[PDB]
Design a binder for this molecule. Structure first.
Ligand code: NAP
Ligand code: FOL
Ligand code: MN
Ligand code: MN
Ligand code: MN
Length: 159
């Protein structure tokens, strides 16, 4: 099973200048809980944005060029990325925009955080078709001293 996990600001913005400008510790904790002990697939730009391997997960990087760091696994196509995960129950695709576009048709589950923030961005989550997806979990949180925007954790499953 393939799943996508992402945090979306208003208008599906996910990034600006190879960064995420907001800071929501509660959402990063949600990301860690839902990805730990699973393989994570990411594109090269997202690898450079994170800047280090994510511990406790097999890190798989998509790039058309040879890898430059043997602490992670480098692959050259979507099919190779999937194969490199082996026989696991759930593969987590962690972006960015161009990777999400390619894996969306193959995904059965979306873990989406909706952040009530307006962000200028240059990268968006794919337009997906709402009729294809059933919301099976949603949990709303107001802003607090640690998290400066309200946010909604949602899990959707392909109907
Ligand atoms: N809010 C969130 O949830 C979230 C999550 C992840 C990322 N982001 C943000 O998203 C932005 C990065 O997204 P992005 O769309 O620019 O880039 P990306 O999807 O992270 O990376 C694209 C790169 O991945 C490689 N790639 C993708 N598909 C491939 C394929 N089929 N075969 C081979 N290589 C492939 C290519 O690398 P080469 O050029 O080396 O061939 C391509 O240039 C940043 O702003 C980041 O902060 C946000
Ligand atoms: N919901 C969601 N939020 C995100 O921030 C997110 N980020 C990415 C890609 N970028 C990043 C950037 C930093 C870390 C990171 O530092 N993660 C630590 C945080 C642990 C914690 O704060 O409790 C990790 O070990 O996962 C992960 C992904 C992909 N999907 C996402 N999905
Ligand atoms: Mn091929
Ligand atoms: Mn197999
Ligand atoms: Mn806000």
């Amino acid at each position: 099973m393939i799943s996508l996990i992402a945090a979306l600001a208003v208008d599906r913005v996910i990034g600006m200048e190879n960064a995420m400008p907001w800071n929501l510790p509660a959402d990063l904790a949600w990301f860690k809980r839902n990805t730990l002990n699973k393989p994570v697939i990411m594109g090269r730009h997202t690898w450079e944005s994170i800047g280090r391997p994510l511990p406790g997960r097999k890190n798989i990087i998509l790039s058309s060029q040879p890898g430059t760091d043997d602490r992670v696994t480098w692959v050259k196509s979507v099919d190779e990325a999937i194969a490199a995960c082996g026989d696991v129950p759930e593969i987590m695709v962690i972006g960015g925009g161009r990777v999400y576009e390619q894996f969306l048709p193959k995904a059965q589950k979306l873990y989406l955080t909706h952040i009530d923030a307006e962000v200028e961005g240059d990268t968006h989550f794919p337009d997906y078709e709402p009729d294809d997806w059933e919301s099976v979990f949603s949990e709303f949180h107001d802003a607090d001293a640690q998290n400066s925007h309200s946010y909604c954790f949602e899990i959707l499953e392909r109907r």
